[PDB]
């Protein structure tokens, strides 16, 4: 109807009818909203005048009028000015509309002021009425008795107080397992919703306090927090809890988890602290990781299944006198035979290996160290017929055995570092012969591996002497070895020298070697790697633009921040430098490991553009991103890329499919058997190009890798955490197109998947079924399979803490720890 009688009351000059007007307008404010909005400034004049006690009422009218107009922003300001008379409309069946917009607005303000300082609860930028309506909303959730709703709004509002109260009161120990359950849900949502480190750090470290009050709880949950922040003090305090218990089985269990998940530098200092706490020396061997290697060795010795007719077939199809062909077969068999020191490849192909020469025979010597990766006690024994002191026949063997010895001892080679260093210092005072250059070449890649994640400034200095020689192939290798040692340090001296030596040289090999090693050095600092990215992207050189892309990749690896991916997308299309376009698209995959669901949609575009290098990096983006569980779509997008005319795309497309489906079953997705024959079919054919036969054959060895026992674990599900080793191997592997030896680094992305049960007293469609079958302990188990296994209700081996449901070593309690039981012998035990 008309609002006209109502306007007249305001205008009427007596006090009394002006008080009544605000009441009358407000009753039917949802009927006459468009009418009274024109004359809303009359009502603002009555708010000024102090002859009303309905000032609060006058303000309240304004809110309802501005919501119906369209501006929600203005309504909440004046709702807050009204003060009270806004707490009666939070549960009506008509109007809660003005209230809900307040809950939204506090979240916007909350983000902005938290970053300056954690406190913002005493700022005048936040109205006191605003805090009240927010609070009472979260209380209503608790009256309904779901805390998931209450915690969810508290995360957005950057509240430390309310999240502290809910978990505090959800401790009462009427089921310890249930208390932990509610913390798990929030830990997941923290990672996937909050991409701001400050707030997220505060929540994680706070969650620790609730876990550690309970006397019984899942301590995997305590460890999750420790690995995300990488504070050795929280790590130590966590072990300190378990030392008051004096319980061996737990301490051994979580130590197995920690070495894989956290960084190598975290472990190197952490053990020292624990030594001066006082511990058992067993735990401290396990933290170095030497036991842990032995347990994995045993799993692969026993269960590996390899194809000897395939070894013959590749040998027949691809020639040892044909140097490209010989590279493919050496690499391919090595990945298949990987994870146990087996000599079957050497004896079968004993005349075939020698027929090659140049860098291909260098590749062949280092493929031995792919097969014999690990086996620490025996590492030197199997490499000794090649090593200098009885090798002088070929310079490729002498240097390439040192490279292959580096793979065996990668991340465990602290003693080995000393031995290889003698060799380098000798050769870095010389410019070398061509005997010496090849020999020094493989020493430099190798020591990178042995001293990885050690932070040896001794090694950085050692290799700085080689760079200064200006030796052609030795200097490219020196640069790579420096980057591998100083991974995740962000040291400024090292950064400065390599970046400048690029201009000093005219060698493309060397310039490239620095550019991609600089990426390793800035691993995981994200926007403190930013100053470098600016320098490298603004550079006139194409090579520094090639490496700048990889610097983004490793810095923001495992985090899908909007900024990093934006820059990489732009660089790729807008450049007309073939090497650069390829590199930028590969880099995306690292950044988006967090959400591999999105990668096939984003890079569907890029495969659509029909440029070869662009298409090459796009296959590599799918392969790296999706290297875990298989996606039907990922397969489909790659499939015509095995048919393209350009043969460089064909190589990438099949290698990517092999990374994606690494050990799945052909009853677990029936595309596994089909795709396997597709690689084989190209090889069988000799009417195709050698580029294509090379692509299928290398991919075949990756596909069968481990004997089909290992899978690539980009992000562990043991704690939901990034794996440093997996990232490092893959970026080195993408250099295989520019130097073939570097293929072997993919072994660092193979992490063995199995559940290994251990006695904790001397250390020896719709898949699910309600009808079990029994599975033996120390057989192959996948991340996807694990969640359906649950220890029997009456079981003689029961874990001390309810099972994690993902692959790795889990200590069991044995009810009779001294009665005989058949054991599987450990590789440690077999020797000594």
């Amino acid at each position: 109807t008309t609002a006209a009688p109502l306007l007249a009351l305001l205008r009427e000059n007596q006090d009394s009818v002006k008080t009544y007007a605000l009441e009358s307008i407000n009753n039917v404010v949802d009927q006459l909203w468009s009418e009274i909005s024109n004359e809303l400034p009359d009502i603002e004049a009555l708010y000024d005048d102090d002859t009303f006690s309905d000032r609060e009422m006058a303000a309240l009218i304004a809110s309802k009028v501005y919501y119906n107009l369209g501006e929600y922003e203005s309504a909440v300001k004046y709702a807050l000015a009204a003060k009270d008379r806004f707490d009666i409309d939070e549960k009506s069946q008509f109007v809660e509309t003005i209230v809900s917009k307040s809950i939204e607005m506090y979240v916007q303000e909350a983000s902005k002021q938290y970053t300056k300082d954690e406190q913002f609860y005493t700022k005048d930028i936040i109205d006191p009425k605003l805090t009240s309506i927010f609070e009472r909303m979260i209380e209503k959730c608790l009256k309904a008795s779901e805390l998931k709703l209450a915690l969810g709004i508290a995360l957005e509002g950057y509240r430390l107080d309310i999240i502290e109260s809910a978990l505090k009161s959800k401790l009462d120990q009427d089921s310890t397992s249930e208390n932990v359950k509610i913390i798990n849900y929030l830990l997941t949502l923290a990672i996937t919703t909050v991409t701001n480190s400050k707030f997220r750090s505060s929540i994680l470290r706070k969650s620790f306090d609730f876990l550690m009050n309970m006397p019984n709880c899942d301590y995997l949950t305590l460890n999750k927090v420790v690995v995300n922040l990488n504070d050795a003090g929280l790590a130590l305090q966590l072990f300190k809890k378990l030392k008051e218990e004096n319980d061996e089985g737990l301490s051994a269990q979580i130590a197995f988890d920690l070495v894989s998940s956290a960084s190598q530098q975290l472990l190197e200092i952490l053990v020292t602290e624990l030594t001066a706490q006082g511990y058992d020396p067993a735990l401290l061997n396990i933290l170095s990781g030497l036991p842990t290697c032995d347990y994995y060795n045993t799993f692969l010795l026993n269960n590996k299944n390899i194809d000897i007719g395939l070894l013959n077939k590749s040998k027949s199809s691809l020639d040892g006198k044909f140097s490209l062909f010989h590279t493919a077969v050496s690499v391919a068999n090595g990945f298949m035979h990987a994870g146990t020191t087996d000599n079957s490849f050497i004896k079968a192909n004993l005349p075939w290996l020698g027929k090659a020469q140049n860098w291909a025979k260098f590749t062949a010597t280092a493929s031995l160290g792919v097969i014999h990766k690990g086996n620490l006690l025996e590492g030197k024994k199997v490499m000794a017929p090649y090593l200098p002191g009885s090798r002088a026949s070929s310079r490729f063997i002498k240097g390439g055995s040192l490279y292959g010895l580096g793979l065996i001892y990668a991340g465990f080679g602290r003693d080995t570092t000393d031995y290889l260093k003698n060799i380098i210092v000798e050769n870095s005072g010389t410019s070398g012969d061509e005997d010496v250059d090849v020999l020094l070449h493989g020493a430099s890649l190798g020591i990178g591996l042995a001293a990885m994640g050690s932070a040896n400034i001794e090694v950085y200095e050692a290799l700085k002497e080689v760079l200064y020689n200006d030796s052609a192939t030795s200097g490219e290798a020196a640069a790579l070895g420096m980057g591998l040692c100083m991974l995740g340090t962000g040291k400024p001296e090292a950064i400065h020298d390599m970046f400048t030596y690029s201009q000093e040289t005219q060698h493309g090999n060397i310039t490239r070697g620095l550019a991609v090693g600089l990426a390793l050095i800035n691993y995981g600092r994200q926007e403190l790697a930013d100053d470098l990215i600016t320098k490298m992207l603004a550079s006139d050189e194409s090579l520094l633009r090639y490496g700048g892309a990889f610097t983004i990749a490793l810095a923001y690896a495992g985090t899908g921040n909007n900024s990093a991916v934006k820059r990489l997308l732009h660089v790729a299309v807008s450049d007309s430098n073939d090497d650069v376009r390829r590199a930028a698209v590969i880099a995306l995959g690292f950044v988006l490991l967090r959400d591999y669901t999105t990668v096939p949609r984003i890079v569907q575009l890029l495969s659509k553009s029909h440029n070869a290098h662009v298409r090459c990096g796009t296959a590599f983006a799918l392969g790296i991103a999706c290297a875990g569980k298989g996606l039907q779509s990922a397969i489909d997008v790659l499939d015509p890329l095995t048919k393209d005319p350009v043969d460089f795309v064909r190589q990438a497309a099949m290698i990517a499919l092999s990374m994606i489906l690494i050990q799945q079953t052909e009853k677990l997705n029936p595309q596994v058997a089909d795709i396997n024959k597709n690689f084989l079919s190209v090889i069988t054919n000799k009417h195709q190009e050698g580029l294509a036969k090379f692509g299928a054959c290398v991919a075949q060895g990756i596909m069968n890798a481990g004997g089909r026992n290992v899978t690539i674990q980009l992000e562990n599900a043991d704690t939901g955490t990034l794996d440093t080793k997996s990232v490092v191997g893959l970026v080195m592997f993408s250099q295989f197109w520019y130097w073939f030896p570097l293929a072997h680094f993919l072994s660092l992305s193979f992490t063995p998947t199995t559940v290994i049960g251990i006695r904790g007293s001397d250390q020896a469609k719709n898949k699910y079924s309600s009808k079990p079958y029994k599975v033996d302990n120390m057989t192959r188990i996948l991340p996807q399979q694990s969640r359906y296994i649950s220890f029997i209700k009456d079981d003689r081996f029961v874990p001390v803490r309810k099972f994690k449901g993902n692959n790795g070593v889990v200590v069991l309690r044995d009810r009779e720890p001294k009665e005989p039981v058949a054991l599987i012998e450990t590789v440690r035990q077999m020797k000594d």
Binding site: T2, W33, S37, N68, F94
Partner: protein
Amino acid sequence: LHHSEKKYAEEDQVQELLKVLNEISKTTLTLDPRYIWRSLKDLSSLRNQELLNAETLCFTVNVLYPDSSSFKKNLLKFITSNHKSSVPGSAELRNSYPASFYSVNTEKKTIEVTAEINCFMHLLVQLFLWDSKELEQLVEFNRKVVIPNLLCYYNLRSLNLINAKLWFYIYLSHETLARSSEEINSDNQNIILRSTMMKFLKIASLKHDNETKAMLINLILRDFLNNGEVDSASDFISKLEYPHTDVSSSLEARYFFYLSKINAIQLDYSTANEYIIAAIRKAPHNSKSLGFLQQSNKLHCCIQLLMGDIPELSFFHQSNMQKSLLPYYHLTKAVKLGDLKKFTSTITKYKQLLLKDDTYQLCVRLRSNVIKTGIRIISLTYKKISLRDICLKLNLDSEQTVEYMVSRAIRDGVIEAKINHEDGFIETTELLNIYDSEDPQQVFDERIKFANQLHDEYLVSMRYPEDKKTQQNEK
């Protein structure tokens, strides 16, 4: 036999409901549910009318009801009661569903999803009353029953879209009862009718339902116009929010037609003209739409005489709408010729008809436009023309009077002449050759931008239905 006929009608309705129930269990949506819902409403409108007055009643009884089944039955008692097909086997079922409102489950109360069902039983009772063509108390009872049910709890997005279509029928049946036989309580209850409609629009704002918002805006404009509360509607139309995203093209036709009414009253004849052509091009050619078109064409002729533009004679002849439009055809000839005497005859001959459509108010403003159109014809025909000659032609008074008409008339620019009062003639300013002026520049710019705007609308629309099909499995 008799049970078979009511059972068949029921089974048609069930498949349509079940389709939507499945769709809203995955994720509530707006447009995919509506297309089905519109198809069901057609079938119900046809079956209620043609097949007895108790085929609605069978359904209402068959499902669980808060108290609706008894309120339905009441309406039927008055026009010769029904009692048949309400015994078990019309009430021992809740009608094939998988488990979400199935017989076994609902009776057992392992679930109860009366949510969707209640809104559809409302849809039937509104359809059934307009089919009967009856009004009295039955209207009142329909108003009372459904409104607070829907206001004692918030609706889901799907349920809000059913209840927008009920509001139109409540409003229409109240307004027809006043027009059959005016009453004195119809007037006081109209304030009540008025209150609910605007309060509804706020309710729909929070649910973010595009199609619910548009249909209520159409109702507020119509409701003001029959009450003649144009003042309040003038504030409303400069403070709207209408979307054209998901709305049906009937809603869009109506919306533009309402504007043309209010605008014409405010003495905007240039904006009114643009919008009335919009309303007609959306509407079909059908006899379904016939009455919408007649009222629209009545207004369309009227706007042109208000401008000085003067409708086509062809326009009446190409349509078969001649006899409805007979009074505007006599006005068209009158204003063109300049004959006041012809005009005065037309408005006395047809006064009653014009006053029915409430377009008579608009028609009296045309007594002015004869005089002003008459002076524009005389300034075209003679460049310079004495004052006396005008007085003879249009049957006016002194020359001093005629001077005043022109002084006012060129403030709008209708005549485009100027008076010399010491030279004793009227001299028009047109002598075209504006292509030697800078005018066409301005014009071509505008047409180019008009083209750019149609390009843009082409872009967003072309790919949005394409996108639904390519995502959807049909392989």
